[PDB]
Amino acid sequence: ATTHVTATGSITLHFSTSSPQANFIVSLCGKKTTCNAECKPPADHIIGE
Amino acid sequence: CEPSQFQCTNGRCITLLWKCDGDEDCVDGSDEKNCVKKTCAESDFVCNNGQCVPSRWKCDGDPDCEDGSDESPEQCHM
Amino acid sequence: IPFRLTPTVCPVPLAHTPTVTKWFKGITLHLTATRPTLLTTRKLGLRADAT
Numbered sequence: 001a002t003t004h005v006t007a008t009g010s011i012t013l014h015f016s017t018s019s020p021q022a023n024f025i026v027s028l029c030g031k032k033t034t035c036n037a038e039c040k041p042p043a044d045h046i047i048g049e
Numbered sequence: 050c051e052p053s054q055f056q057c058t059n060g061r062c063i064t065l066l067w068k069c070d071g072d073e074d075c076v077d078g079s080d081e082k083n084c085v086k087k088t089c090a091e092s093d094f095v096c097n098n099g100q101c102v103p104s105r106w107k108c109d110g111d112p113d114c115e116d117g118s119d120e121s122p123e124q125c126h127m
Numbered sequence: 128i129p130f131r132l133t134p135t136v137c138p139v140p141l142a143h144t145p146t147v148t149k150w151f152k153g154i155t156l157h158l159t160a161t162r163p164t165l166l167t168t169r170k171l172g173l174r175a176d177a178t
């Protein structure tokens with residue numbers, strides 16, 4: 001929910017989704033960007049959470 | 050601790066089955082206190098004040114009772 | 128009337144942990160047990176199909 005920001009660089013962020021497509025909008029101090037990919041179905045069938 | 054657990058003075062939880070069962074497990078000794086008297090054992094010597102000691106300590110040459118009854122000649126006649 | 132019923136703590140057996148084989152919308156438990164052991168399943172939803 002909150003990350004550190006240097007003058008330049010890159011930050012990694014983990015997300016959980018239910019759509020096969022990752023076409024959502026990510027905001028970073030209110031600056032909005034659009035991600036685009038294809039999310040594969042999981043291989044494991046049963047999860048504990 | 051839990052209602053089925055007994056809390057020692059060190060913050061460690063043990064079971065109620067370990068409360069007043071002969072062995073001390075609460076580090077400081079919160080268990081084995083209060084309850085009823087253990088009335089020693091059939092293989093344990095009884096001091097005059099009521100203290101229970103092992104029977105091998107009776108007249109071994111060194112005092113072990115609080116009142117020193119284990120070395121008295123009234124029980125072992127030399 | 129002596130010998131009051133009092134609440135104490137007693138040990139009860141722990142069964143063998145079942146191996147779970149995991150398929151697409153289900154699990155399969157293997158459930159070895161020398162003695163009778165209660166297995167109770169419920170669904171975490173509107174209809175709890177409690178078995």
Ligand SMILES: [Ca+2]
Pocket residue numbers: 067068069070071072073074075080081
């Ligand atoms: Ca104990």
Ligand SMILES: [Ca+2]
Pocket residue numbers: 106107108109110111112113114119
């Ligand atoms: Ca002695």
